[PDB]
């Protein structure tokens, strides 16, 4: 399974920004509250303006993630000194396009700007994770980290912005994104554990956790409220995720059979390979109409499993003569979560750089 | 610029938290045989706790508590050690005001007390600096905001008071007290930065607002009986600061009037400032000379400015001295907030200890 073709990965689109005309409000605030000349802070106002321009049309590359983090941090610094939140003195309209309906959604709340930047940070990470071919050890670790970062941005959004500014950032939808990104992160790590030929029981647990994440993501995709919101996107994701559920369940039992082989449980060995083959055949059924990237991985795995089943059944029938136990007689494989949503500290000075607005207050 | 003394909170004393037996029991049934693989992940947390519960009272002391607080979150994510859960063990800490030992079989009790001590340590580091230089005022201000943030997080995420020192009313007292002192540090900075007199007046008025909030809690009978002597010493300093910074506020309102050539209004504000200061001196009885020296010098400033203002008005300007209700009160300008704690920040927690406890 070292050379198994890599499955395609899902990525989210970035939200697109409207207007955020903070400049008049900051100068209104400094004039009225500080009794100072607002033009003394024009330079701090250029930096944030230039920083926003870069962030709202961020380039889709690794460096773009730092641009979004730095702008996210500077928004926190600005909010600490100028009250631009909901119902506050210096608040101005913040407009962003809700990604699923295309509606313009406006809030006089700087936290709305923060939320959408954080959403795009998670989206951008998902893109960078999905772009890599994951041929080399480096690509698998970089993609895995990208997906954990994407899960971390969506998780932070879910926890610290509980009031959903738009339906694309509701708790249910962000939970879908997190579970999907963790499933894809765990998947990359599974590919790593195989290329390193880790202990077979280890791979089986890692693969079983891939199933668990995708099952939770699939439960949200089957929720009618999510289906009507995502529309055709829900159909595209569900097809791939449901197929992956059975594919990686087959991979798990494939390696459970490898473990049985190592412990000389030769009857148990054929049972797991038989189960792995049945689960894969269901994945193949669910994969009909999907691109060749998917088919090549399934075909490749069918050769592996099919060959191992014939070997195990021939060994048991002519040498070991051990009873083939039913599946329920065997303790199930418990998934091992080795990935997590990586926490975000928006005001970490090491990522935000100097506070643009240190001269205020 | 006068520099008043600052209040700080003592750290809670930790008792026993014998998590090793429960973890080993949990991993044996749920993950099978070998306990030996997990003993070092348990010994690393144990040493982390020993450092945290004997944290040195310095800046990195905060990182030690932060690091341990984060690893506790990682442990709770893998081993169910909350109240009513499989692997819960007794957690014992000393309630700081009564000295009584309080035990809960809940890992969130350990987290709460570590978080409390993080806020207490910040208050100490903020109150230790003499605030002579711009960096000292801002550093202390950050510490007091971090202390407010720790007590606020405790108030929001642990609503069920594990002990009376962490009840909603007492944490609210701590937050307002810490924000008042943070605001006070920025007031001092705004004075040495020569900010506009109207802004200094608003900043000082907000100091009064925070301390009034703290003072109403200190006057609550149930808090007085719980805090004991501490309520006396806090209230004595807070009540004095209420009138002192109300005088500082009206001092600078009178200086704004001077800038706008409302020389009658100028007398009214200086007269009001002097009266408020005299009450602060009434309330400052028995307080250390740091307090007395600050008040004595402020009396020189306000007392002289009142005499000059009244002489000028009586012989030159002859403008009507308005009472006091005719002038819109000063609106406070909050410049400080409880800073987020970020308990699971990888930059401070380091790698997750229990990567084997999956």
């Amino acid at each position: 399974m070292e050379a198994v073709p890599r499955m395609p990965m899902i990525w989210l689109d970035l939200k697109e920004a409207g207007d955020f005309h903070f400049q008049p409000a900051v100068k209104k605030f400094v004039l009225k509250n500080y009794g100072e000349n607002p033009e003394a802070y024009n330079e701090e106002l250029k930096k944030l303006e230039l920083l926003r321009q870069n962030a709202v049309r961020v380039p889709r590359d690794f460096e773009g993630c730092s641009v979004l983090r730095k702008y996210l941090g500077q928004l926190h610094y600005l909010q600490s000194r100028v009250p631009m939140g909901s119902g506050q003195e210096a608040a101005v309209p913040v407009t962003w396009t809700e990604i699923f309906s295309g509606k313009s959604v406006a809030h006089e709340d700087i936290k709305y700007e923060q939320a959408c930047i954080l959403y795009n940070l998670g989206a951008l990470h998902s893109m960078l994770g999905a772009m890599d071919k994951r041929v080399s050890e480096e690509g698998m670790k970089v993609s895995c980290t990208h997906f954990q970062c994407a899960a971390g941005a969506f998780a932070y959004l879910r926890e610290h912005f509980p009031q959903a500014y738009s339906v694309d950032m509701s708790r249910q939808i962000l939970t879908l994104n997190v579970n999907l990104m963790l499933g894809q992160a765990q998947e990359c790590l599974l590919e790593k554990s195989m290329l390193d030929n880790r202990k077979s029981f280890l791979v089986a647990r890692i693969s079983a956790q891939v199933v668990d994440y995708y099952k939770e993501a699939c439960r949200a995709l089957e929720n009618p409220d999510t289906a009507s919101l995502l529309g055709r996107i829900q159909k595209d994701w569900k097809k791939l995720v449901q197929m992956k559920i059975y594919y990686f369940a087959a991979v798990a039992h494939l390696h459970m059979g490898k473990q049985a082989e190592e412990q000389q449980k030769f009857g148990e060995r054929v049972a797991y390979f038989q189960s792995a083959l049945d689960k894969l055949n269901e994945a193949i059924k669910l994969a009909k109409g999907q691109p060749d990237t998917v088919q090549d991985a399934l075909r490749f795995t069918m050769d592996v499993i099919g060959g191992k089943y014939n070997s195990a059944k021939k060994d048991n029938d002519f040498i070991y003569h051990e009873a083939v136990p039913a599946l329920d007689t065997l303790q199930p494989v418990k998934g091992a979560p080795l990935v997590k949503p990586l926490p975000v500290n928006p005001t970490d000075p090491a990522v935000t750089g100097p506070d643009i607005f240190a001269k205020l207050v | 610029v006068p520099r008043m003394p600052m209040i700080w909170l003592d750290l809670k004393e930790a008792g026993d938290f014998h998590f090793q037996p429960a973890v080993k029991k949990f991993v044996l049934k749920n993950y099978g045989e070998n306990p030996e693989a997990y003993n070092e992940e348990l010994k690393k947390l144990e040493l982390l706790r020993q450092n945290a519960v004997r944290v040195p009272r310095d800046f990195e002391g905060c990182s030690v508590l932060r690091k341990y607080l984060g690893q506790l979150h990682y442990l709770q994510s893998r081993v169910p050690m909350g109240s009513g859960q499989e692997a819960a063990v007794p957690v014992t800490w000393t309630e700081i005001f009564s000295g009584k030992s309080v035990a809960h079989e809940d890992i969130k009790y350990e987290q709460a007390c570590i978080l409390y001590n993080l806020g207490a340590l910040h208050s100490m580091l903020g109150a230790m600096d003499k605030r002579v230089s711009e960096e000292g005022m801002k550093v202390s201000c950050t510490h007091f905001q971090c202390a407010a943030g720790a007590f606020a997080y405790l108030r929001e995420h642990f609503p069920q008071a594990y002990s009376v020192d962490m009840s909603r009313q007492i944490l609210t007292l701590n937050v307002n007290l810490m924000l008042g002192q943070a605001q006070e540090c920025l007031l001092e900075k705004s004075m040495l930065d020569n900010r506009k007199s109207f802004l200094v007046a608003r900043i000082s008025a907000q100091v009064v607002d925070y301390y009034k909030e703290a003072c109403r809690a200190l006057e609550n009978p149930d808090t007085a009986s719980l805090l004991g002597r501490i309520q006396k010493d806090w209230k004595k300093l807070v009540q004095m600061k209420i009138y002192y910074f109300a005088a500082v506020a009206h001092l600078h309102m009178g200086k704004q009037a001077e800038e706008q050539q409302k020389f009658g209004e100028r007398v009214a504000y200086f007269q009001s400032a002097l009266d408020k200061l005299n009450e602060a001196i009434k309330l400052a009885k028995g307080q250390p000379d740091t307090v007395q020296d600050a008040l004595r010098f402020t009396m020189d400033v306000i007392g002289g400015k009142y005499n000059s203002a009244k002489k000028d008005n009586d012989f030159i300007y002859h403008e009507a001295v308005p009472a006091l209700d005719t002038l819109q009160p000063v609106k406070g300008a909050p410049l400080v907030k409880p800073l987020p704690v970020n308990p699971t920040d990888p930059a401070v927690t380091g790698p997750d200890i229990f990567a084997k406890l999956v």
Binding site: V142, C144, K192, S193, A336 | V358
Partner: peptide, 20 residues
Amino acid sequence: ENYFQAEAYNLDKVLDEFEQ
């Protein structure tokens, strides 16, 4: 800072811990 690169590099350590 190198948080992203540090996390990606640590994945080897993660699997190593989980293997022992």
